[PDB]
Amino acid sequence: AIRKYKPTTPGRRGASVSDFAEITRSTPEKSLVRPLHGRGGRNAHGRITTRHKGGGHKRAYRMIDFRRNDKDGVNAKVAHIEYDPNRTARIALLHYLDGEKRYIIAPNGLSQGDVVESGANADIKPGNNLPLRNIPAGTLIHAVELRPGGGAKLARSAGSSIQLLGKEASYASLRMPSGEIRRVDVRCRATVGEVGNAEQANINWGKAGRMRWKGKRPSVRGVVMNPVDHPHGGGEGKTSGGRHPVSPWGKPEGRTRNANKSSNKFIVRRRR
RNA sequence: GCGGAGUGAUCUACCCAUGGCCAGGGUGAAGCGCGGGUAAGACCGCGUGGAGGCCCGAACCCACUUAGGUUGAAGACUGAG
RNA sequence: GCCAGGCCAGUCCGCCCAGGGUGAGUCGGGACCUAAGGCGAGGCCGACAGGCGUAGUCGAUGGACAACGGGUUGAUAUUCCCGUACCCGUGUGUGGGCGCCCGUGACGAAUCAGCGGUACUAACCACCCAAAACCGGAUCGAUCACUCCCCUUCGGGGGUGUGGAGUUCUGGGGCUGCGUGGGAACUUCGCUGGUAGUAGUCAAGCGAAGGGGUGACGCAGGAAGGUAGCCGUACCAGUCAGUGGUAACACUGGGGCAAGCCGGUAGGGAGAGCGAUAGGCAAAUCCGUCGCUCACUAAUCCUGAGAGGUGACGCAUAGCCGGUUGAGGCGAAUUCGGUGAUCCUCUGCUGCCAAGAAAAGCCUCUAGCGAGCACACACACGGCCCGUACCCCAAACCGACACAGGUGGUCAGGUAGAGCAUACCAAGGCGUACGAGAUAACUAUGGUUAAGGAACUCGGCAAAAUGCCCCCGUAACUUCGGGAGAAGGGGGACCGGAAUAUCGUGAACACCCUUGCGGUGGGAGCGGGAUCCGGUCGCAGAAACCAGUGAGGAGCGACUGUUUACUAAAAACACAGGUCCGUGCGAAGUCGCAAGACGAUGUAUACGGACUGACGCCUGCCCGGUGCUGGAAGGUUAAGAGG
RNA sequence: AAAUUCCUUGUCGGGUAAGUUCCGACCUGCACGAAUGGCGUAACGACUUCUCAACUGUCUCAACCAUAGACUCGGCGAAA
RNA sequence: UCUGAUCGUAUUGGGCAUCUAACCUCGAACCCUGAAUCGGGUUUAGGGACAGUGCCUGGCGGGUAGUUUAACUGGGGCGGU
RNA sequence: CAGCUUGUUGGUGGGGUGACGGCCUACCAAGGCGACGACGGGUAGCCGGCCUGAGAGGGUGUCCGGCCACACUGGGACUGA
RNA sequence: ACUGCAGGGGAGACUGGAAUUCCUGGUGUAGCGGUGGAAUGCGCAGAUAUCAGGAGGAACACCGGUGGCGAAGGCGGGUCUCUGGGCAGUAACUGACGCUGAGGAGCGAAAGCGUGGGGAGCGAACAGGAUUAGAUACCCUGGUAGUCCACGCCGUAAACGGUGGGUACUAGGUGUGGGUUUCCUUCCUUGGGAUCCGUGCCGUAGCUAACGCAUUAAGUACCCCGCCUGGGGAGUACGGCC
RNA sequence: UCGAAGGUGGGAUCGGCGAUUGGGACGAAGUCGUAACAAGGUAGCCGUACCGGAAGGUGCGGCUGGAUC
Ligand SMILES: [Mg+2]
Ligand SMILES: [Mg+2]
Ligand SMILES: [Mg+2]
Ligand SMILES: [Mg+2]
Ligand SMILES: [Mg+2]
Ligand SMILES: [Mg+2]
Ligand SMILES: [Mg+2]
Ligand SMILES: [Mg+2]
Ligand SMILES: [Mg+2]
Ligand SMILES: [Mg+2]
Ligand SMILES: [Mg+2]
Ligand SMILES: [Mg+2]
Ligand SMILES: [Mg+2]
Ligand SMILES: [Mg+2]
Ligand SMILES: [Mg+2]
Ligand SMILES: [Mg+2]
Ligand SMILES: [Mg+2]
Ligand SMILES: [Mg+2]
Ligand SMILES: [Mg+2]
Ligand SMILES: [Mg+2]
Ligand SMILES: [Mg+2]
Ligand SMILES: [Mg+2]
Ligand SMILES: [Mg+2]
Ligand SMILES: [Mg+2]
Ligand SMILES: [Mg+2]
Ligand SMILES: [Mg+2]
Ligand SMILES: [Mg+2]
Ligand SMILES: [Mg+2]
Ligand SMILES: [Mg+2]
Ligand SMILES: [Mg+2]
Ligand SMILES: [Mg+2]
Ligand SMILES: [Mg+2]
Ligand SMILES: [Mg+2]
Ligand SMILES: [Mg+2]
Ligand SMILES: [Mg+2]
Ligand SMILES: [Mg+2]
Ligand SMILES: [Mg+2]
Ligand SMILES: [Mg+2]
Ligand SMILES: [Mg+2]
Ligand SMILES: [Mg+2]
Ligand SMILES: [Mg+2]
Ligand SMILES: [Mg+2]
Ligand SMILES: [Mg+2]
Ligand SMILES: [Mg+2]
Ligand SMILES: [Mg+2]
Ligand SMILES: [Mg+2]
Ligand SMILES: [Mg+2]
Ligand SMILES: [Mg+2]
Ligand SMILES: [Mg+2]
Ligand SMILES: [Mg+2]
Ligand SMILES: [Mg+2]
Ligand SMILES: [Mg+2]
Ligand SMILES: [Mg+2]
Ligand SMILES: [Mg+2]
Ligand SMILES: [Mg+2]
Ligand SMILES: [Mg+2]
Ligand SMILES: [Mg+2]
Ligand SMILES: [Mg+2]
Ligand SMILES: [Mg+2]
Ligand SMILES: [Mg+2]
Ligand SMILES: [Mg+2]
Ligand SMILES: [Mg+2]
Ligand SMILES: [Mg+2]
Ligand SMILES: [Mg+2]
Ligand SMILES: [Mg+2]
Ligand SMILES: [Mg+2]
Ligand SMILES: [Mg+2]
Ligand SMILES: [Mg+2]
Ligand SMILES: [Mg+2]
Ligand SMILES: [Mg+2]
Ligand SMILES: [Mg+2]
Ligand SMILES: [Mg+2]
Ligand SMILES: [Mg+2]
Ligand SMILES: [Mg+2]
Ligand SMILES: [Mg+2]
Ligand SMILES: [Mg+2]
Ligand SMILES: [Mg+2]
Ligand SMILES: [Mg+2]
Ligand SMILES: [Mg+2]
Ligand SMILES: [Mg+2]
Ligand SMILES: [Mg+2]
Ligand SMILES: [Mg+2]
Ligand SMILES: [Mg+2]
Ligand SMILES: [Mg+2]
Ligand SMILES: [Mg+2]
Ligand SMILES: [Mg+2]
Ligand SMILES: [Mg+2]
Ligand SMILES: [Mg+2]
Ligand SMILES: [Mg+2]
Ligand SMILES: [Mg+2]
Ligand SMILES: [Mg+2]
Ligand SMILES: [Mg+2]
Ligand SMILES: [Mg+2]
Ligand SMILES: [Mg+2]
Ligand SMILES: [Mg+2]
Ligand SMILES: [Mg+2]
Ligand SMILES: [Mg+2]
Ligand SMILES: [Mg+2]
Ligand SMILES: [Mg+2]
Ligand SMILES: [Mg+2]
Ligand SMILES: [Mg+2]
Ligand SMILES: [Mg+2]
Ligand SMILES: [Mg+2]
Ligand SMILES: [Mg+2]
Ligand SMILES: [Mg+2]
Ligand SMILES: [Mg+2]
Ligand SMILES: [Mg+2]
Ligand SMILES: [Mg+2]
Ligand SMILES: [Mg+2]
Ligand SMILES: [Mg+2]
Ligand SMILES: [Mg+2]
Ligand SMILES: [Mg+2]
Ligand SMILES: [Mg+2]
Ligand SMILES: [Mg+2]
Ligand SMILES: [Mg+2]
Ligand SMILES: [Mg+2]
Ligand SMILES: [Mg+2]
Ligand SMILES: [Mg+2]
Ligand SMILES: [Mg+2]
Ligand SMILES: [Mg+2]
Ligand SMILES: [Mg+2]
Ligand SMILES: [Mg+2]
Ligand SMILES: [Mg+2]
Ligand SMILES: [Mg+2]
Ligand SMILES: [Mg+2]
Ligand SMILES: [Mg+2]
Ligand SMILES: [Mg+2]
Ligand SMILES: [Mg+2]
Ligand SMILES: [Mg+2]
Ligand SMILES: [Mg+2]
Ligand SMILES: [Mg+2]
Ligand SMILES: [Mg+2]
Ligand SMILES: [Mg+2]
Ligand SMILES: [Mg+2]
User: Which interval of the chain is the signal sequence (predicted)?
Assistant: First the structure.
């Protein structure tokens, strides 16, 4: 699962890395790859809108099939499990019996060579994609969509899962990875099972260089700035900031969710 | 110093795309084998292997100390480290 | 040319004057392609100004694409000329081949009659229920009438037995139906004869829209096989350098040549047919997927550095003659080894995680077009636009200067050396622009120093010292990796012998066979390193240049890194790790009036903010204040309503 | 008794011939204290600080040599 | 009958519920469209008189802006006046 | 005190001894010792004997006798049976 | 070896009910909780109580015992999969292949440690109330780690039968468990008798200072291992291993 | 060549002193509490964790070397 480096250097002393034991076919599928380029956290104006971005290893995008709507009743065979630099889960390449190749998020327990079904008549097995109406309550699902046909949007990171609490009339109550209970329409599609690569959260990056490779740039604390730069700046020695904690633009801590967002009627219980 | 409207990222700060460069030595990680060990092991020793914000050190990038310069060769440099 | 300029002078000049000089189908670009990014028809947004952006169109620092050697001018040359190549296009002939119609072959339906799928289902058969209505059983309680019985103010209970419209369970045909299962004819579909081998389709060639494949990609590390270059050498042509020796292999010089074409080596890679087909915006014989057979260690095919041939009867060259010292003319030998890449095979191979452009181009499929086509040879032609002079670690560029500064890429020889360090040299350049003198102090840059050895000083600042290779040996502590080159020691030159395979590198003459760019033995010639023993010299053998000082105790920051261009490099910043808070998704946050964008082609193991800052042990008490989160009983409180 | 301690060269011990610095304690903390983290910590440092070996013109205490200037002659010829 | 408690036609506003048709959707499909992740239109699936916006109005608001922050004084500050 | 040894273990050919022998030397093998305690630390002359104890045993090595080791400390050769 | 027998022996996976708590809604108003007595605390902004639905973790009443199993520690909600051991019977097979075991190795309650998850209830630490001269406690109200899961670490308990393992022998009486066996075999009795393996109690001899042991010995003998030489200091110091 | 003595160096082992500091034993007729021996007033012990002037207290698991129906 996780391989620990040996303390041969100070940079490697405590670090660890995935063993990549689940990976076959170390190259991607040429027909499902699109170009990508970095932004450095800059928007269309050319200005930094997200801080601490840039550098980073070059990447290529792999088209993930997040809809899974048009292959109902058509079986697929899992051909490979591949590394993806754009997400924390691994991806599985599917060979459809119709001759088409697709990429999906690899669920937990979807070894190469398995058969994957879709539609209302599919069996309840990891990797099978069904509308929520046909999934029994208490199941663990992932890659759920908010609107019918809108594409999977929830529970997509490594190790994520959603528990189908129940379907009442035309809505399904879901326990979402944050712990918030939500309702979505029963016609929304979901995939059975939990997302794989669940142990990646235990990886110990060893040095600053590794995060620079992953594209994360250094972050400077507010209390070591000058007051013209940050509200926490100033002071003779080191201070705690001369006030209650605030953002670099002076906003205090507290809830930032819009108080009367339209979706409030779909949320049963806020997270802890 | 204040206001209005414009000009500047050929210097410099960061970022994006596409290219180039890093003499010569040293150390010897994982993994892979063989043998020892056992019921199996764990482990151990020999090889192979060639990792690393690894070591010494030119090009290259810097600028710690000191001497000189200080109407300078130079509006920030030279010599030795 | 010499009155300005050149840090002096100048007959000289990067200065002044006149004239001359830059030749491309292949070099670098355009006419080809796209990245980041720019502009942007319509468009969306915005009082106006304008912002953003789709189709599209630009934009190399990248992709694709055809040339090498020699000569020549005062000044250009892969451009001109000579020799020899390659790429794209056009015309003219010649030859055979396939096609239009003819027919050639092949493939190739449709009509209508015989039965079932009993699929349709009027009905019919079975399975449960309303099991309808109704006959009618047991129980219930305070209604009800009946007859038997009893107190009472004359109004009703009770033993309730019967049943009434009575509650519930249920005894019985469940006729009518519901739901399901079998299920009547034509009707949906199939077979046999039949329309009929008929209609009809395909069979030269081109397909550039569109589909598909390729193009197409990271970093690190070698190894093997090669080659360039370099060092010798067979052979060739010469020299006598006025010194003691040296007359020929003693010494000096030579000991060359490309693209292209042929070739298919070492090394690499590849299963082949047939059938089906929901997918690839239409189609597809293409791609993808699936099934079957055969094949698998082979064979075949592709790729492929090198070797060899040709290019080359040519060019070049050491040298020799004559030479206004310009041009001329002649012109030898050219073999075999060693060493050896930063280059080639190799867009390969191995390993790793941080997971590594696009489009054109090329190939292929069909849509489509199509009566003429495709090919071979020969001849004759067309190949456009811009750059090309000269400087280019500089006196010609950026620094006001002919300024000790700065400036990307390519080539890069010998001896010693690990080396692109360092010392001296080659090829090739240069002596660079004020000089000539003179033992003043003093300043600067170097050098040496008796005895002492940090006594100097804020402080060992500066200088001195250590320094290489090989062999021994190596502490506390430790996160077990380190500390460590710890510390501290020993040896090092030359000559000879071992020593003729001593050893190790490659492998000539000469040894077999599937005869080749083949295999084995073989050991010549040529290079390399180490050790032991004996001897020799010096003050000194790492010889010059070059080239770690080491140890012990504390503080701070874990570490590599970053920082005040021009007085501060640190204990400051960052960091991996930690906790808290926010964010349920065109999220929170940020830019923007807005549209829109980034976040992210991400989805709570994610993203943003704050503080702390490897690791180890831990992180105590306080919610009074102020923030944040949540609640709404009460008080207070705006516009509006009311008037 | 600290990058925090004014008094202050606090007191005791070590080191030195002689130690306001250094190291180990004491606790009388002017004015330490647990993520503006507390206490340690192998490795690392052109960081700050103390000691030792070796070495030396840093010094006792200076002396000599060469070069570039300074000095003389010819030419050009500024500046505050 | 200050009629507290109260009924039925008017009228009205406040809550709650439902609906769809205004309005909303970066849900989907098709056309403009030959090349289109823009835009617009058509249909559909949802939300829905909410939200958003205009005008009026209360709160909060070092996020930004313009400013103020006296004099005397055996120098100024401290104190005092 | 849990790992000790490299002339150390053995063999070969010489040298050396009065005499066998790594005793010494040149070459070859990788062996030899160790939990029945090597290697290391502390202590000590051994025995016949002496004392005590019914005995087994416990203590001790002085008179005397036997031997060993030493001659200021450390090292070496010669004469000689 | 073959045939039967009993079992909470162990591991994994799925799953069930009761109860507590919490959430939502209905009914509903002024108390609830707590003690020897109270107060802190909770509710009045709608609590306790009652109903219905949902969420979640822990533990499995009745069976259940004096019982069974396991080397010890320990072991029962149910089902399935995998697996260990024991007992009985035949004597089918080998033929002393046995016992103990220095060191060594493995297993090993609870508490605790590392990493991730989980957390209903309880509950060190901590806080408030109460008692008391004081109350850093006993009592009450709360409440963190922990108790739970996964993989590791730790190897300590009054880890006790305060009794090392193996074998042979030494009256009986009375319960229970698993077998087998003829007979009384219907005396239905699943009783009695015989044997083997256990598990309790009482009791003969013997042993013991006594208490007591007594076929499950602390009796009579043998073999092997471990341990003690008065009490503190001390199972502590130093050294060493983990 | 070997070879006593001597010098240089890093280590190994055994002791002595040491500012300061921890625990132990004994002393007197001190101060602060009553933890155990009774159900010792909250039963006592065993292993661990945490806390507090101190004896000790609390939690987890085990024993009776106590009692109860
Ligand atoms: Mg812009
Ligand atoms: Mg950030
Ligand atoms: Mg930071
Ligand atoms: Mg600052
Ligand atoms: Mg700024
Ligand atoms: Mg501010
Ligand atoms: Mg500050
Ligand atoms: Mg401060
Ligand atoms: Mg803070
Ligand atoms: Mg501040
Ligand atoms: Mg201005
Ligand atoms: Mg501009
Ligand atoms: Mg290197
Ligand atoms: Mg290895
Ligand atoms: Mg490095
Ligand atoms: Mg810098
Ligand atoms: Mg200076
Ligand atoms: Mg000067
Ligand atoms: Mg300098
Ligand atoms: Mg320098
Ligand atoms: Mg002139
Ligand atoms: Mg002049
Ligand atoms: Mg634009
Ligand atoms: Mg326009
Ligand atoms: Mg563009
Ligand atoms: Mg262009
Ligand atoms: Mg280019
Ligand atoms: Mg020229
Ligand atoms: Mg030509
Ligand atoms: Mg690609
Ligand atoms: Mg090679
Ligand atoms: Mg001569
Ligand atoms: Mg020669
Ligand atoms: Mg195919
Ligand atoms: Mg050739
Ligand atoms: Mg030119
Ligand atoms: Mg030129
Ligand atoms: Mg140029
Ligand atoms: Mg210039
Ligand atoms: Mg210059
Ligand atoms: Mg440069
Ligand atoms: Mg060279
Ligand atoms: Mg050089
Ligand atoms: Mg020279
Ligand atoms: Mg001169
Ligand atoms: Mg003079
Ligand atoms: Mg001297
Ligand atoms: Mg001297
Ligand atoms: Mg000194
Ligand atoms: Mg001094
Ligand atoms: Mg002095
Ligand atoms: Mg110095
Ligand atoms: Mg020096
Ligand atoms: Mg050394
Ligand atoms: Mg050290
Ligand atoms: Mg000599
Ligand atoms: Mg060095
Ligand atoms: Mg300290
Ligand atoms: Mg640092
Ligand atoms: Mg620290
Ligand atoms: Mg500076
Ligand atoms: Mg500086
Ligand atoms: Mg620095
Ligand atoms: Mg900084
Ligand atoms: Mg937003
Ligand atoms: Mg969070
Ligand atoms: Mg905070
Ligand atoms: Mg900090
Ligand atoms: Mg951080
Ligand atoms: Mg507070
Ligand atoms: Mg507060
Ligand atoms: Mg409060
Ligand atoms: Mg509030
Ligand atoms: Mg102090
Ligand atoms: Mg202080
Ligand atoms: Mg002091
Ligand atoms: Mg000093
Ligand atoms: Mg001190
Ligand atoms: Mg705190
Ligand atoms: Mg502080
Ligand atoms: Mg704090
Ligand atoms: Mg800190
Ligand atoms: Mg500290
Ligand atoms: Mg550094
Ligand atoms: Mg530093
Ligand atoms: Mg100090
Ligand atoms: Mg003069
Ligand atoms: Mg509205
Ligand atoms: Mg404000
Ligand atoms: Mg202001
Ligand atoms: Mg003003
Ligand atoms: Mg005043
Ligand atoms: Mg005054
Ligand atoms: Mg020998
Ligand atoms: Mg011998
Ligand atoms: Mg003695
Ligand atoms: Mg006796
Ligand atoms: Mg002696
Ligand atoms: Mg004497
Ligand atoms: Mg002697
Ligand atoms: Mg004699
Ligand atoms: Mg003799
Ligand atoms: Mg488990
Ligand atoms: Mg809860
Ligand atoms: Mg309620
Ligand atoms: Mg309730
Ligand atoms: Mg037999
Ligand atoms: Mg045993
Ligand atoms: Mg044992
Ligand atoms: Mg436990
Ligand atoms: Mg734990
Ligand atoms: Mg945890
Ligand atoms: Mg309290
Ligand atoms: Mg309690
Ligand atoms: Mg509680
Ligand atoms: Mg803890
Ligand atoms: Mg264990
Ligand atoms: Mg027990
Ligand atoms: Mg015994
Ligand atoms: Mg026994
Ligand atoms: Mg026994
Ligand atoms: Mg019995
Ligand atoms: Mg008894
Ligand atoms: Mg006894
Ligand atoms: Mg102990
Ligand atoms: Mg110890
Ligand atoms: Mg003392
Ligand atoms: Mg007591
Ligand atoms: Mg007690
Ligand atoms: Mg009491
Ligand atoms: Mg008690
Ligand atoms: Mg307590
Ligand atoms: Mg306890
Ligand atoms: Mg207990």
Answer: none
**What is the spatial distance between Cα A2 and Cα A208, in angstroms, rounded to a whole number?**
20
* Per-residue DSSP letter, A48: B
A213 CA distance to ligand 39 middle (Å): 44
State in Å, rounded, how far the first CA of chain A is from the last one. 30
| Ligand 60 geometric centre to CA of A67 (Å) | 52
User: How long is chain A?
Assistant: 272
What span, in angstroms and rounded, lies between the C-alpha atoms of A210 and A215?
9
- Picking from A115, A109, A92, A105, the residue whose alpha carbon sits closest to that of residue A29 is A92
- Tell me the C-alpha distance between A160 and A195, whole Å: 5
* Three-class secondary structure of residue A199 per DSSP: helix
Instruction: Tell me the structure's resolution in angstroms, rounded to a single decimal.
Output: 2.6
Phi, psi of A174 (to 5 degrees): -120, 140
The DSSP string of A200-267 is: GGG----SHHHHHHHTB-----GGGS-TTT-TT---SS--S-SSS-B-TT-PBSS--S-TT-GGGGGE
CA distance A208 to A211: 5
Q: Are A117 and A106 in contact (CB under 8 A)?
A: no
The closest of A135, A81, A164 to A173, measured between CA atoms, is A164
Method: cryo-EM
CA distance A129 to A116: 8
As a rounded value in angstroms, the CA-to-C1' distance for A146 and C524 is 88
